[PDB]
Amino acid sequence: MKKILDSAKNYLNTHDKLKTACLIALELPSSSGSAATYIYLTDYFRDVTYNGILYRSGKVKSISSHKQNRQLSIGSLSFTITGTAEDEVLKLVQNGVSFLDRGITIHQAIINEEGNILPVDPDTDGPLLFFRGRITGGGIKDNVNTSGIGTSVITWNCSNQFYDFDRVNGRYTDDASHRGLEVVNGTLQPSNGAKRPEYQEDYGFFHSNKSTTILAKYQVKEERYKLQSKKKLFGLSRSYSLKKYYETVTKEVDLDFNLAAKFIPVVYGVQKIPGIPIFADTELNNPNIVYVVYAFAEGEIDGFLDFYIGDSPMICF
Amino acid sequence: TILDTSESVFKNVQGILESFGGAINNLSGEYRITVEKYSTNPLRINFLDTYGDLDLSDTTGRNKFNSVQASLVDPALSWKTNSITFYNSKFKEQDKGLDKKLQLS
Amino acid sequence: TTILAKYQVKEERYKLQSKKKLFGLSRSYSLKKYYETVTKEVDLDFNLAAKFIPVVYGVQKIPGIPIFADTELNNPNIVYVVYAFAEGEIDGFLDFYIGDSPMICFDETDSDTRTCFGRKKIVGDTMHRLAAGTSTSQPSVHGQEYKYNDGNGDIRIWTFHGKPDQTAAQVLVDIAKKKGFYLQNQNGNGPEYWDSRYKLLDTAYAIVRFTINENRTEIPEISAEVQGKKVKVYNSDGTIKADKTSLNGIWQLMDYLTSDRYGADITLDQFPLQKVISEAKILDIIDESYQTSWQPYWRYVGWNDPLSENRQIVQLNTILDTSESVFKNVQGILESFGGAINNLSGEYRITVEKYSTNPLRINFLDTYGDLDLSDTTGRNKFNSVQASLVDPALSWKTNSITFYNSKFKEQDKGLDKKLQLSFANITNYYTARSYADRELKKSRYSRTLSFSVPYKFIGIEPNDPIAFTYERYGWKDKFFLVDEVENTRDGKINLVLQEYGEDVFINSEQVDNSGNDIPDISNNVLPP
Amino acid sequence: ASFRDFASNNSTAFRDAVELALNENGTTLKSLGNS
Amino acid sequence: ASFRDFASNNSTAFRDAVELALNENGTTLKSLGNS
Amino acid sequence: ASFRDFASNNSTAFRDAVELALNENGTTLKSLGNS
Amino acid sequence: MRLPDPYTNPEYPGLGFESVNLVDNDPMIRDELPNGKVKEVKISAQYWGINISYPELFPDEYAFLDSRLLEYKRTGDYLDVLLPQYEAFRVRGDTKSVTIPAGQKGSQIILNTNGTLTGQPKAGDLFKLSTHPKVYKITNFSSSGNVWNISLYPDLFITTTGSEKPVFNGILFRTKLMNGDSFGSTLNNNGTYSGISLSLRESL
């Protein structure tokens, strides 16, 4: 329940003819990420000043309906510009320009008798928010009729942060991915692709490629290249059947053809997880003493409660 | 919880939810997390306050069950699976003794 | 299989390695599901799809399906077992994996762990070194016997290539003639147990003879590295060259499409030879990003002579699991080098993505007046790529190619978006890296255009260069590639263009991964 | 024709109408999240 | 609008019209019984 | 009625309209080639 | 080809337009902005449309007319028409010695008569270039001695190449029939074909 000022609760109950305007503020698609230019637009017939920002009129034509269910889904919205402005057309059809992560905020403003904005939102003492998200898509539709009236509509597509549902954001256990290596002139140099600028001089995952093969020498013929599945049970819903759901659950995965088994999990609370080797080597004069490094979990963990050397924990039940 | 990071962000969020209810909502600008609850002061809607349309739909079949069977990874066992099964005599006294089981994990 | 199981471990009793490990990551799969589906071994007692004969183009590792297994009469510990490798006339067998260790050891590191011959790294030694005794880098010889003794027992191979007119193996015929086979005498069969009729036409195989003794008490899993079926390479002048397998994707697809033995029977009549020949040279363009010296496993990536160029832009060493459907097999051969089979204008036309300096000029006034622009930057634009492939530098395991782009992340306000890929038919590391870079570049142009043109301009086909010029926009000869073309009977052509760029087809410089090979020198007992 | 735009404005109805003929037999469209 | 009721009265036609565009490629809707 | 013929003449639009409501959540129709 | 009319065939006075409708057809991408401003973009080419209505045609006149129309439909060429209301010969002289300097696009045009033409083309009259078959309409005129400045309603379809000659008289519209698919003629008991009409449309 988004609380509304009691002052607005009187206007929304007494007045029947409500003059509403939608204030749009979208970031300009720019070739580079430098600076942050904003185009401010409105659906009202006259320009509307909000927080000193002049939302110019005459461009926006229509806005779609924002629908939200109780199942996680992208919240799609579609607002259309006139398409005959010829100054908005070039911004959309410009070459070498990307708007992958450009945002947009839309306000729902109610105009008074004197032409001002009726305060509704208690925290801001201003208008409500209709939608705020990201720009994912776009298009223009030219329709030249050989006899009659033609139309052109520029439609911008909007959604929330989960627009790319097929996106795997994870720190794969590899040097090339951890430091964001990229060939610059003739060498693989760390770049800004790393999730942190301090990851550029982190060689922790340098020997992760040969760790499994070296470790396999000191294992049984079985379990030579294997690892337990990080998550055993994942959830039974209407997308599965009993037989299929309980047959899909696996115990161990082969590491020589499963690149998804080398991702670092994140654990909240007390849970049992396998360890992914990232280093394995013996001493020089004592070859039977082997150091092997296993990377458990991600982030600052509280600690390790117990270690299962084989299938038997060090602290007995 | 264990979040297999090799999964998609969308599916990971969808899996974190449905474990405690939850519904991420992007309406009114912010991201709002809402869970199912009971309140003693709900909002009163009369049908005369609506636009006149009304659609009632009760799909008792395929959605109404008399007993539940669930499973979980229980550290009481060696992190194996334990089954929780119980019946309800009232719900089977209703529905004319039909046997309908809810399967959960 | 049942007879062979007697001479195996309790595990691997009825098992066989999957013919194709990696098959291709597309929008039909997710990362977790795709990498969980990949299997290593299949049980032969309930998998009838594991007894189909695969077809191999180029140098690839495939398991052997047993088709015969029997011991000698007075020497019951000597067992003859016949494994059928691949289909068609193959160039030969490069190496044999007796267990998990090839007869020709990888390098110096693998030589000091077991009894081996030659080196597969730099030297590129082949199995024929066993018979010749010198440094030989060419495949086996049809019907020649090879002797391999690693110190634990004698093993003889008798490699047989596919041929339309194979004759029955003389060794097995000679053994069956004198009632030498044990189960032959057990069941009372005579010389017909193995006869001249046992020709095994159009199927390569090897008759590996095991001498089970005190040391090799079990028959290990047999796998081999074949060089692949010979294909017909058409030349512009008119001559026909079919003597060796070709790594070119178009020739492999043409062989798969014109074979009535395996696949669809599309006659060579329904094919424009000139167009296919011209399109093959597009995949034959020499890449100058890397150096030939940077690949030490030159012999086992399809190359035949390190002195030669061998730097084609797209090179494919493919395994086609024939148990798949013809439609899916063709769809999998494509999407490995681009490609689009087109049935318009009568013939079957193979078109690949390319850049041209003389595209066809379409002005918007030449259209029917309609125009639809659609750019789905979300879900299609990425800043970095991560790919995987089966690399013979490792023991045919999976190697990951990951690199970022600082320019694409300077754009898009530093958003982290990764492209996930998996190459099935590519084994060369540098070729896979180049293809991943091309895909990453091509993802930055996500904008399509649809319009209709009159009957004139007839002849437009997918993957054709077109320059669009609409003065209302800032467009003057904008490069586009045809994606959808529809022909109507009333002389109207509907088109859907896909935006491309010039930078898509230039190759960025890369470095050498020659020193990051990880041979699997495990799975064997180290000597004292 | 101009039917594409319309259908794109009523997609959920199409989804429901599809899932209503697959439920005749035991098929349903909620079995795609697995794949 | 009132299009939902109609589509709910012609569901099988929708199913067939859908399965007719998936058969263009090798996809078909009879592959949901497995899942 | 005669709606079947029509829908059979506009199948791709139906496919797209269906796939546009499944993309609301993480479902999509390109996940049938596996099965 | 030429559409028959009393000027070409005076022996058939039944031919000749009982009423001619010269419509203006300029498609435009008109958009009505929410602020009250109307924005229209011209992209599609403009074309004059001619609707000709004939009086009571006797059998021989209709035989000639439909013979000519069927020859049109057969050989597939264009059908020229001459509107008589715009046949006021307001400009005497021969226009061969009139030069139009090259490199001119848009409504405005400049032509030098070199002291040859006699008569001033007033606004509303027709104009047509020698090479291109498009027919324009003079909207304003202004002359400084011999040089004439003419403003035309449709923008010059082709840029003048320095050889195009003005045509101020005998302007023919290169039209195409739009009633060909179903064109019927009724014969009365009085002996005349009634309600013969044509919906022409300028091509290119």
PDB file of C-alpha atoms in Angstrom, chain G residues 20-142:
ATOM      1  CA  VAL G  20     -14.078  17.075 -65.517  1.00  0.00           C
ATOM      2  CA  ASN G  21     -12.839  16.730 -61.931  1.00  0.00           C
ATOM      3  CA  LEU G  22      -9.164  17.670 -61.549  1.00  0.00           C
ATOM      4  CA  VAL G  23      -8.297  16.405 -58.074  1.00  0.00           C
ATOM      5  CA  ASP G  24      -5.054  17.012 -56.191  1.00  0.00           C
ATOM      6  CA  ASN G  25      -3.507  13.866 -54.692  1.00  0.00           C
ATOM      7  CA  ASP G  26      -0.478  14.540 -52.494  1.00  0.00           C
ATOM      8  CA  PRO G  27       0.021  11.767 -49.912  1.00  0.00           C
ATOM      9  CA  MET G  28       1.523  13.054 -46.689  1.00  0.00           C
ATOM     10  CA  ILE G  29       2.625  11.754 -43.295  1.00  0.00           C
ATOM     11  CA  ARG G  30       0.352  14.027 -41.269  1.00  0.00           C
ATOM     12  CA  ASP G  31       0.610  13.846 -37.482  1.00  0.00           C
ATOM     13  CA  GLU G  32      -1.548  15.746 -34.982  1.00  0.00           C
ATOM     14  CA  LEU G  33       0.659  16.580 -32.024  1.00  0.00           C
ATOM     15  CA  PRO G  34      -0.901  16.708 -28.534  1.00  0.00           C
ATOM     16  CA  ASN G  35       0.116  20.367 -28.160  1.00  0.00           C
ATOM     17  CA  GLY G  36      -2.089  21.476 -31.074  1.00  0.00           C
ATOM     18  CA  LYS G  37       0.683  21.656 -33.708  1.00  0.00           C
ATOM     19  CA  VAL G  38       0.013  19.672 -36.945  1.00  0.00           C
ATOM     20  CA  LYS G  39       3.185  18.184 -38.540  1.00  0.00           C
ATOM     21  CA  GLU G  40       2.967  16.716 -42.092  1.00  0.00           C
ATOM     22  CA  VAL G  41       5.915  15.188 -44.060  1.00  0.00           C
ATOM     23  CA  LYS G  42       5.784  14.884 -47.867  1.00  0.00           C
ATOM     24  CA  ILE G  43       7.386  11.644 -49.090  1.00  0.00           C
ATOM     25  CA  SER G  44       5.152   9.999 -51.695  1.00  0.00           C
ATOM     26  CA  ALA G  45       5.010  11.622 -55.117  1.00  0.00           C
ATOM     27  CA  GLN G  46       2.053  13.813 -56.057  1.00  0.00           C
ATOM     28  CA  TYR G  47      -0.176  12.971 -59.011  1.00  0.00           C
ATOM     29  CA  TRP G  48      -3.101  14.748 -60.641  1.00  0.00           C
ATOM     30  CA  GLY G  49      -6.308  12.747 -60.872  1.00  0.00           C
ATOM     31  CA  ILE G  50      -8.782  13.327 -63.705  1.00  0.00           C
ATOM     32  CA  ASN G  51     -12.423  12.220 -63.513  1.00  0.00           C
ATOM     33  CA  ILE G  52     -14.133  12.600 -66.899  1.00  0.00           C
ATOM     34  CA  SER G  53     -17.899  12.316 -67.386  1.00  0.00           C
ATOM     35  CA  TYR G  54     -19.398  11.945 -70.843  1.00  0.00           C
ATOM     36  CA  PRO G  55     -22.810  13.071 -72.128  1.00  0.00           C
ATOM     37  CA  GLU G  56     -25.243  10.844 -74.023  1.00  0.00           C
ATOM     38  CA  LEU G  57     -23.082   8.957 -76.523  1.00  0.00           C
ATOM     39  CA  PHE G  58     -24.596   7.662 -79.752  1.00  0.00           C
ATOM     40  CA  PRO G  59     -23.564   4.167 -80.915  1.00  0.00           C
ATOM     41  CA  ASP G  60     -20.955   5.306 -83.454  1.00  0.00           C
ATOM     42  CA  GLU G  61     -19.310   7.766 -81.057  1.00  0.00           C
ATOM     43  CA  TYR G  62     -19.146   5.103 -78.357  1.00  0.00           C
ATOM     44  CA  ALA G  63     -17.760   2.650 -80.915  1.00  0.00           C
ATOM     45  CA  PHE G  64     -14.922   5.061 -81.672  1.00  0.00           C
ATOM     46  CA  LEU G  65     -14.343   5.805 -77.981  1.00  0.00           C
ATOM     47  CA  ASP G  66     -14.241   2.214 -76.770  1.00  0.00           C
ATOM     48  CA  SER G  67     -12.180   1.184 -79.799  1.00  0.00           C
ATOM     49  CA  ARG G  68      -9.560   3.731 -78.740  1.00  0.00           C
ATOM     50  CA  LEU G  69      -9.814   2.655 -75.087  1.00  0.00           C
ATOM     51  CA  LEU G  70      -9.438  -1.022 -76.001  1.00  0.00           C
ATOM     52  CA  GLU G  71      -6.410  -0.177 -78.144  1.00  0.00           C
ATOM     53  CA  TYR G  72      -5.049   1.510 -75.011  1.00  0.00           C
ATOM     54  CA  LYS G  73      -5.731  -1.628 -72.972  1.00  0.00           C
ATOM     55  CA  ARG G  74      -4.129  -3.783 -75.675  1.00  0.00           C
ATOM     56  CA  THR G  75      -0.844  -2.037 -76.454  1.00  0.00           C
ATOM     57  CA  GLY G  76      -0.453  -1.033 -72.804  1.00  0.00           C
ATOM     58  CA  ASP G  77       0.971   2.448 -73.390  1.00  0.00           C
ATOM     59  CA  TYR G  78      -0.092   5.625 -71.627  1.00  0.00           C
ATOM     60  CA  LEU G  79      -3.264   7.574 -72.405  1.00  0.00           C
ATOM     61  CA  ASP G  80      -2.802  11.318 -72.930  1.00  0.00           C
ATOM     62  CA  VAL G  81      -5.667  13.747 -72.303  1.00  0.00           C
ATOM     63  CA  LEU G  82      -6.033  17.466 -73.006  1.00  0.00           C
ATOM     64  CA  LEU G  83      -8.140  19.435 -70.529  1.00  0.00           C
ATOM     65  CA  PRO G  84      -9.849  22.210 -72.540  1.00  0.00           C
ATOM     66  CA  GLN G  85     -10.406  24.711 -69.714  1.00  0.00           C
ATOM     67  CA  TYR G  86      -6.615  25.161 -69.525  1.00  0.00           C
ATOM     68  CA  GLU G  87      -6.312  25.601 -73.306  1.00  0.00           C
ATOM     69  CA  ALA G  88      -6.439  29.406 -73.172  1.00  0.00           C
ATOM     70  CA  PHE G  89      -3.555  30.241 -75.515  1.00  0.00           C
ATOM     71  CA  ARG G  90      -2.155  33.015 -73.333  1.00  0.00           C
ATOM     72  CA  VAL G  91       1.447  32.629 -74.572  1.00  0.00           C
ATOM     73  CA  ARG G  92       2.206  32.988 -78.279  1.00  0.00           C
ATOM     74  CA  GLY G  93       5.498  32.127 -79.921  1.00  0.00           C
ATOM     75  CA  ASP G  94       7.875  29.220 -80.385  1.00  0.00           C
ATOM     76  CA  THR G  95       9.650  28.030 -77.244  1.00  0.00           C
ATOM     77  CA  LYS G  96      12.629  26.262 -78.846  1.00  0.00           C
ATOM     78  CA  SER G  97      14.819  29.359 -78.405  1.00  0.00           C
ATOM     79  CA  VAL G  98      13.903  29.525 -74.693  1.00  0.00           C
ATOM     80  CA  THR G  99      16.664  28.272 -72.393  1.00  0.00           C
ATOM     81  CA  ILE G 100      16.211  27.004 -68.830  1.00  0.00           C
ATOM     82  CA  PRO G 101      19.569  27.181 -66.985  1.00  0.00           C
ATOM     83  CA  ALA G 102      20.655  23.840 -65.563  1.00  0.00           C
ATOM     84  CA  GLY G 103      20.870  22.919 -61.895  1.00  0.00           C
ATOM     85  CA  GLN G 104      17.431  23.936 -60.622  1.00  0.00           C
ATOM     86  CA  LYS G 105      15.422  21.945 -58.083  1.00  0.00           C
ATOM     87  CA  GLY G 106      12.350  22.880 -56.082  1.00  0.00           C
ATOM     88  CA  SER G 107       9.222  24.854 -56.839  1.00  0.00           C
ATOM     89  CA  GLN G 108      11.005  27.890 -58.278  1.00  0.00           C
ATOM     90  CA  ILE G 109      12.229  27.913 -61.878  1.00  0.00           C
ATOM     91  CA  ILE G 110      14.069  30.508 -63.973  1.00  0.00           C
ATOM     92  CA  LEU G 111      13.819  30.538 -67.769  1.00  0.00           C
ATOM     93  CA  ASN G 112      15.125  33.045 -70.315  1.00  0.00           C
ATOM     94  CA  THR G 113      12.871  33.676 -73.310  1.00  0.00           C
ATOM     95  CA  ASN G 114      15.573  35.754 -75.066  1.00  0.00           C
ATOM     96  CA  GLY G 115      12.840  38.111 -76.260  1.00  0.00           C
ATOM     97  CA  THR G 116      10.770  35.473 -78.053  1.00  0.00           C
ATOM     98  CA  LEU G 117       7.519  34.848 -76.167  1.00  0.00           C
ATOM     99  CA  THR G 118       4.545  37.222 -76.209  1.00  0.00           C
ATOM    100  CA  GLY G 119       1.987  36.913 -73.429  1.00  0.00           C
ATOM    101  CA  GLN G 120       2.119  36.527 -69.663  1.00  0.00           C
ATOM    102  CA  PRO G 121       1.204  33.180 -68.033  1.00  0.00           C
ATOM    103  CA  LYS G 122      -1.057  34.128 -65.147  1.00  0.00           C
ATOM    104  CA  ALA G 123      -1.356  32.115 -61.949  1.00  0.00           C
ATOM    105  CA  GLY G 124      -3.482  28.980 -62.101  1.00  0.00           C
ATOM    106  CA  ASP G 125      -2.389  27.999 -65.612  1.00  0.00           C
ATOM    107  CA  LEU G 126      -0.618  24.741 -66.413  1.00  0.00           C
ATOM    108  CA  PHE G 127       3.072  24.173 -67.092  1.00  0.00           C
ATOM    109  CA  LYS G 128       5.033  21.166 -68.324  1.00  0.00           C
ATOM    110  CA  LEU G 129       8.675  20.488 -69.140  1.00  0.00           C
ATOM    111  CA  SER G 130       9.610  19.166 -72.571  1.00  0.00           C
ATOM    112  CA  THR G 131      11.384  16.025 -71.356  1.00  0.00           C
ATOM    113  CA  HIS G 132       9.588  14.953 -68.191  1.00  0.00           C
ATOM    114  CA  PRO G 133       5.844  14.208 -68.527  1.00  0.00           C
ATOM    115  CA  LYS G 134       4.871  15.695 -65.152  1.00  0.00           C
ATOM    116  CA  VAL G 135       2.304  18.503 -65.239  1.00  0.00           C
ATOM    117  CA  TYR G 136       2.693  21.386 -62.798  1.00  0.00           C
ATOM    118  CA  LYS G 137       0.477  24.357 -61.943  1.00  0.00           C
ATOM    119  CA  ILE G 138       1.735  27.940 -61.897  1.00  0.00           C
ATOM    120  CA  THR G 139       0.981  29.560 -58.539  1.00  0.00           C
ATOM    121  CA  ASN G 140       2.788  32.908 -58.897  1.00  0.00           C
ATOM    122  CA  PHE G 141       4.560  34.754 -61.693  1.00  0.00           C
ATOM    123  CA  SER G 142       7.154  37.536 -61.752  1.00  0.00           C
TER     124      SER G 142
END
